[PDB]
Amino acid sequence: KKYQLVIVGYGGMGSYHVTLASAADNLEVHGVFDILAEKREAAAQKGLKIYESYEAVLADEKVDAVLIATPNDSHKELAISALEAGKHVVCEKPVTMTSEDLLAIMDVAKRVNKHFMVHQNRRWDEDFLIIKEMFEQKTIGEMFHLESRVHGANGIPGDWRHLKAHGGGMVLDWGVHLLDQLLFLVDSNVKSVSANLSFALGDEVDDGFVTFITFENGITAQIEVGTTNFIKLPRWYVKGTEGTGIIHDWDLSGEIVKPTTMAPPSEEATNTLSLPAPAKLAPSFYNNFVDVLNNTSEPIVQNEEVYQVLKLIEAIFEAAETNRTVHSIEGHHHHHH
Amino acid sequence: LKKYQLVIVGYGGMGSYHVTLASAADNLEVHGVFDILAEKREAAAQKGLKIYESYEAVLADEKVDAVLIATPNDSHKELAISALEAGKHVVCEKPVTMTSEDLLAIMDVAKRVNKHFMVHQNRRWDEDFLIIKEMFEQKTIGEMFHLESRVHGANGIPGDWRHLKAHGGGMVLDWGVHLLDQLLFLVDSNVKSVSANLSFALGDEVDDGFVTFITFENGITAQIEVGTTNFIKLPRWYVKGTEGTGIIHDWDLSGEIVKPTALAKTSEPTPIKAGQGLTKTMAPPSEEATNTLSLPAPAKLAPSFYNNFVDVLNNTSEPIVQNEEVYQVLKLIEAIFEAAETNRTVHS
Ligand SMILES: NC(=O)c1ccc[n+]([C@@H]2O[C@H](COP(=O)([O-])OP(=O)(O)OC[C@H]3O[C@@H](n4cnc5c(N)ncnc54)[C@H](O)[C@@H]3O)[C@@H](O)[C@H]2O)c1
Ligand SMILES: NC(=O)c1ccc[n+]([C@@H]2O[C@H](COP(=O)([O-])OP(=O)(O)OC[C@H]3O[C@@H](n4cnc5c(N)ncnc54)[C@H](O)[C@@H]3O)[C@@H](O)[C@H]2O)c1
Numbered sequence: 001k002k003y004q005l006v007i008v009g010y011g012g013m014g015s016y017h018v019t020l021a022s023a024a025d026n027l028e029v030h031g032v033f034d035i036l037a038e039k040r041e042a043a044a045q046k047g048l049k050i051y052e053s054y055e056a057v058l059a060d061e062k063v064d065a066v067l068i069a070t071p072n073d074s075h076k077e078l079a080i081s082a083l084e085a086g087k088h089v090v091c092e093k094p095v096t097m098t099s100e101d102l103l104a105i106m107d108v109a110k111r112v113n114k115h116f117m118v119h120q121n122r123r124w125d126e127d128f129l130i131i132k133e134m135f136e137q138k139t140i141g142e143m144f145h146l147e148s149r150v151h152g153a154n155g156i157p158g159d160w161r162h163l164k165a166h167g168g169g170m171v172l173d174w175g176v177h178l179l180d181q182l183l184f185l186v187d188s189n190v191k192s193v194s195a196n197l198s199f200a201l202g203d204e205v206d207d208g209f210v211t212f213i214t215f216e217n218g219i220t221a222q223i224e225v226g227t228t229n230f231i232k233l234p235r236w237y238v239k240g241t242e243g244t245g246i247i248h249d250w251d252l253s254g255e256i257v258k259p260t261t262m263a264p265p266s267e268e269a270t271n272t273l274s275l276p277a278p279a280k281l282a283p284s285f286y287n288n289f290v291d292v293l294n295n296t297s298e299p300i301v302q303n304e305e306v307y308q309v310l311k312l313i314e315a316i317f318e319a320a321e322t323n324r325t326v327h328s329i330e331g332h333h334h335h336h337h
Numbered sequence: 338l339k340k341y342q343l344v345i346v347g348y349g350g351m352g353s354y355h356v357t358l359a360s361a362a363d364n365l366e367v368h369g370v371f372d373i374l375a376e377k378r379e380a381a382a383q384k385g386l387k388i389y390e391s392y393e394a395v396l397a398d399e400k401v402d403a404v405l406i407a408t409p410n411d412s413h414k415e416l417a418i419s420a421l422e423a424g425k426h427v428v429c430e431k432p433v434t435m436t437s438e439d440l441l442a443i444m445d446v447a448k449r450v451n452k453h454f455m456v457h458q459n460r461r462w463d464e465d466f467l468i469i470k471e472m473f474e475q476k477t478i479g480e481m482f483h484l485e486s487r488v489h490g491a492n493g494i495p496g497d498w499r500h501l502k503a504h505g506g507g508m509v510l511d512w513g514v515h516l517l518d519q520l521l522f523l524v525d526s527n528v529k530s531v532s533a534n535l536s537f538a539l540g541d542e543v544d545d546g547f548v549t550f551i552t553f554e555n556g557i558t559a560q561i562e563v564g565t566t567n568f569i570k571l572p573r574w575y576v577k578g579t580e581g582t583g584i585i586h587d588w589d590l591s592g593e594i595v596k597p598t599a600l601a602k603t604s605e606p607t608p609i610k611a612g613q614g615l616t617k618t619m620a621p622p623s624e625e626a627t628n629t630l631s632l633p634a635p636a637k638l639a640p641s642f643y644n645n646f647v648d649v650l651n652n653t654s655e656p657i658v659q660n661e662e663v664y665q666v667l668k669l670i671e672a673i674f675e676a677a678e679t680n681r682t683v684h685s
């Protein structure tokens with residue numbers, strides 16, 4: 001069929017999903033719901049049908065799927081409601097505020113036989129796909145250390161991202177993208193996590209963080225988000241047994257430097273090269289989502305992967321708060337103590 | 338004419354350079370040289386320097402006031418305690434000892450014999466570091482709360498005895514001591530916690546690099562890193578404060594400072610395409626929101642190490658490199674090694 005999607009939450013990302021979803025082959029934006037009149041008015045201006053309630057969205061038999069782009073605390077119940085009403089769900093990152101909440105959603109999805117997919121759009125980021133190529137094709141030999149940094153100097157945007165109750169802060173906002181990229185790329189269990197949160201801005205939520213992650217296969221990674229950074233460190237810095245790579249910024253500027261376990265290095269005998277062309281990740285998120293609904297393809301963004309990321313986020317919070325190194329992503333649910 | 342006579346013990350790379358360094362001081366000269374190898378004793382003689390046949394002979398010489406110890410790390414403690422007992426003041430190369438307890442022993446002996454022991458922490462005078470010290474003290478970027486200090490290169494481990502655990506080899510003990518000493522000299526706060534990971538990417542029995550994340554009791558954080566397998570270098574300094582950020586790229590002292598203005602609060606950045614999404618928060622701030630400044634002139638550290646050493650001997654000045662500071666660094670190195678070997682975060 002031509003699948004019909006309703007946007008639930010017509011804010012900054014929700015309104016951009018009209019563009020994204022419409023770009024897919026057999027998917028259409030059918031309507032919108034938002035609790036704010038001004039947001040509903042803006043959607044009406046683009047010709048979009050406005051629903052009176054969320055209940056009205058779910059009762060509409062013409063609607064095949066919903067996109068949930070609300071603040072982070074509402075995601076879970078909205079998703080569960082949708083799936084219980086027979087609707088497939090695309091949910092904005094971070095899907096839930098705890099890993100146990102995703103499990104519950106996955107239970108519902110399995111029971112009603114409807115699909116739930118996290119919007120992890122940044123696996124398609126070109127900078128990341130250049131790193132993916134390098135990692136897979138051994139451009140700098142065995143890549144054993146990765147540094148992934150998103151720096152800005154604008155603080156925390158909007159309203160709800162400042163608040164703990166709405167799943168605010170930068171681990172949840174940007175950290176989930178970079179952690180999802182890391183775990184998508186590296187096929188290895190997490191051996192250890194240490195972390196520090198930034199409260200430089202004096203908010204009740206983190207305005208940035210750093211985490212040091214070691215994998216079972218010996219790969220180490222540093223993942224960093226900052227909002228108080230008036231000079232930026234590079235987007236990517238990666239070390240391999242046969243070279244080093246850098247990607248400075250979103251403009252994809254950078255280079256590789258290679259020597260002409262590791263051989264004894266010398267700075268006098270090196271060659272500088274361009275970054276390779278990005279790896280392919282095909283099709284787009286929304287085309288893959290339609291393929292998944294049609295049962296023609298396996299999902300690129302798997303709920304099992306998303307689950308591991310949430311546990312990792314839970315490990316990061318536990319590690320920063322106790323100022324300890326944690327030695328698995330298991331055991332941070334705090335159900336029993 | 339009241340010149341202190343210094344003997345160089347260990348005529349290797351640094352020991353031969355100490356001839357030049359000690360000679361530049363006002364009231365101190367190089368009386369001569371001892372090395373355990375006859376090859377190195379000949380080499381010193383062929384630079385017109387007096388040579389001793391034994392370390393015992395240096396220490397028996399009434400004309401000698403002080404010794405400079407520039408031997409591999411495992412021999413520092415015995416040679417220092419010997420010189421002290423013989424009534425000689427001591428300058429010892431970094432890292433002074435391989436354990437913190439060893440330095441406490443030397444400190445005890447120096448006190449008992451009423452002689453001075455000083456660590457050669459020469460990189461406290463580094464121009465790049467003194468720029469950071471200027472920024473830190475003058476609040477150039479407001480209150481500096483996070484510092485990242487990195488020495489990267491792709492030349493591996495140099496020599497020699499530095500490849501071996503027995504002789505206190507590896508990068509923590511080589512470059513780490515300089516960077517950690519800089520940090521602890523700058524920050525007037527006790528270390529609260531340390532996590533660390535070592536690099537063994539070259540396959541040696543000692544570390545070819547490390548990274549550590551340090552937190553102080555006053556909330557200041559630091560990341561210190563040395564790497565010898567980095568074909569691309571990250572900046573020498575990257576520092577963050579309540580009112581700006583600074584960067585020193587390299588030893589050439591290139592870099593800048595970027596600070597917020599009072600107009601940043603009422604302005605809004607114009608979004609860019611960042612990967613698959615539009616971003617406002619990670620977009621450059623609007624033109625009105627920031628000021629870009631040159632790095633300041635470096636703070637003054639005066640006088641030179643060796644003139645300060647003489648001033649300490651003449652009892653006219655306190656030491657710049659204090660032994661208690663050197664002790665806290667060695668305790669930090671011990672915390673780092675423990676943190677990395679147990680894969681834990683070490684507290685105190
Ligand atoms: N994938 C990405 O690159 C990306 C980018 C930006 C935001 N996001 C995610 O998108 C979500 C929303 O982000 P945003 O920046 O658009 O926030 P926003 O504040 O701009 O939009 C949220 C909208 O949801 C509405 N809303 C709140 N509660 C609702 C309810 N229960 N029912 C229906 N509507 C409700 C609000 O009125 C608002 O219009 C968050 O989960 C965020 O993390 C993802
Ligand atoms: N402060 C700095 O910037 C800096 C720079 C380089 C080296 N160093 C330090 O200086 C010391 C020596 O370093 P190097 O690179 O010159 O080493 P090196 O190998 O070049 O020289 C050491 C010399 O000591 C001699 N020696 C060994 N055992 C001896 C003994 N028991 N008695 C007398 N002489 C002995 C050796 O024969 C050799 O000539 C080390 O502690 C190192 O950490 C410091």
Ligand SMILES: [Cl-]
Pocket residue numbers: 323324325326680681682683
């Ligand atoms: Cl721990």
Ligand SMILES: [Mg+2]
Pocket residue numbers: 183184186187
């Ligand atoms: Mg996998």
Ligand SMILES: [Mg+2]
Pocket residue numbers: 521522524525526
């Ligand atoms: Mg002090």
